[PDB]
Amino acid sequence: TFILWLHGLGDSGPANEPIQTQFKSSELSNASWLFPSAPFNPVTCNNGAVMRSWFDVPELPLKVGSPIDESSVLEAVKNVHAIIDQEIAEGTNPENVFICGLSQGGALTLASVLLYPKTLGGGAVLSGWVPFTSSIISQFPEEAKKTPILWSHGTDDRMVLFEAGQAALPFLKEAGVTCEFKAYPGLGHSISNKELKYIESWIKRRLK
């Protein structure tokens, strides 16, 4: 099993590696985790300040109708796909690949899974958003639409509004993708351990 975790805006891979220690089950004990780090890019919502960032974010908070940026998301998708391609080329079954991420990394998770040519084990989005318009749906590969999505979002999030997460559901229905949406009442823009345990249980169920 291969689990790729994509950090949020400004953060890094090594800062998030301890997330794996919350996945304490026997079933996930042998998983191969990878926590890459985004390049240093200028970020528009931070007035052009440079920080680790998967793709440019024009505005906060993320909302229904907030501006986004497709060429930037696709540069990031290209790199995620290179990682997935190499893992599969080294012999991992595509259905044993899981992509997960927080916020900006959750948006990237979604884009990466939906554009990948093969069905993967799953995409787990934490407090993310849909980082493109419906114009891209025609480009989602046939097998990508079979990859299950688990979307986790805090109801009290004021950085990526809960409504931006709810908006993924009709988008994914249009796209022919199956998504479980898991709301966390009272949670804001952060990860809770219970949220991670539920993701772990979902991975276990997918593995079967």
Author numbering: 4 to 211
The authors write:
To investigate if loop flexibility is directly dependent on the strength of the hydrophobic anchor, we designed a mutant, in which we substituted the phenylalanine, which is the most hydrophobic amino acid on the Hoop-Woods scale, with a leucine (AtSOBER1 F65L). While the mutant crystallized in the same space group and cell dimensions, we found the loop B-factors significantly increased when compared to wild type AtSOBER1, indicating that its flexibility had improved just by changing the residue that anchors the loop inside the hydrophobic tunnel. While the catalytic efficiency was decreased in AtSOBER1 by substituting the phenylalanine anchor F65 by a leucine residue, the opposite effect was observed upon replacement of L110 by a phenylalanine residue in AtTIPSY1. We hypothesize that a more flexible lid-loop renders the surface created by L63 in AtSOBER1 less rigid and therefore less suitable for deacetylation. For pNP butyrate (C4), valerate (C5), and hexanoate (C6), we measured increased catalytic efficiencies after introducing a weaker anchor (AtSOBER1 F65L) and a decrease in AtTIPSY1 L110F. The observed differences in catalytic efficiencies for those C4–C6 chains are mostly resulting from higher or lower turnover numbers rather than significantly different substrate affinities. This suggests that the strength of the hydrophobic anchor determines the flexibility of the lid-loop and that a more flexible loop leads to a significant increase in product release. Our attempts to turn a SOBER1 protein into a TIPSY1 protein by altering the hydrophobic anchor (AtSOBER1 F65L) were a partial success. Weakening the anchor allowed the protein to hydrolyze para-nitrophenyl hexanoate, like AtTIPSY1 is able to. AtSOBER1 F65L also displayed higher affinities to longer-chain substrates and the lowest affinity to para-nitrophenyl acetate, a pattern opposite to wild type.
